[PDB]
Amino acid sequence: GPETLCGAELVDALQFVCGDRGFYFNKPTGYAPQTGIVDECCFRSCDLRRLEMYCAPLKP
Question: Which family does it belong to?
Answer without folding.
Answer: Belongs to the insulin family.
